[PDB]
């Protein structure tokens, strides 16, 4: 007994314009491939290879470049130099 009112007269929605003809034959294999590649993260799972790359690029490489960066803060000036002059501060 509750229906939206009679004075609506709602019509269809177009997007309008010119039917651009198909400039591309889509490949089913290429489209399935690319849809698998962009949405890879919803099927990603941890394995030993994932653990190896996640260890080395997220943990080991920041720690190595970290140690190298904190050791070498005020070591080197080369600004005006001479023979027999050490360039390391330490």
């Amino acid at each position: 007994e509750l229906k939206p009112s009679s004075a609506i007269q709602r019509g269809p929605l177009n997007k309008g314009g010119w039917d651009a003809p198909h400039a591309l034959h889509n490949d089913g294999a290429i489209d399935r491939y690319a849809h698998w590649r962009t949405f890879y993260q919803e099927r990603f799972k941890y394995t030993r290879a994932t653990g190896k790359s996640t260890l080395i690029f997220l943990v080991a490489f920041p720690a190595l470049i970290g140690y190298v960066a904190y050791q070498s803060e005020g070591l080197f000036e080369f600004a005006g130099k001479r023979r027999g002059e050490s360039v390391t501060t330490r």
Binding site: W36, R43, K45, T47, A49
Partner: peptide, 26 residues
Amino acid sequence: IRASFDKAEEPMLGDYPDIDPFPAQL
């Protein structure tokens, strides 16, 4: 299938055919 990283990608794929990788030059 043939390469090692192709085997490393195997448990990720789901509903994807997993075909034999062969070089397009050979």
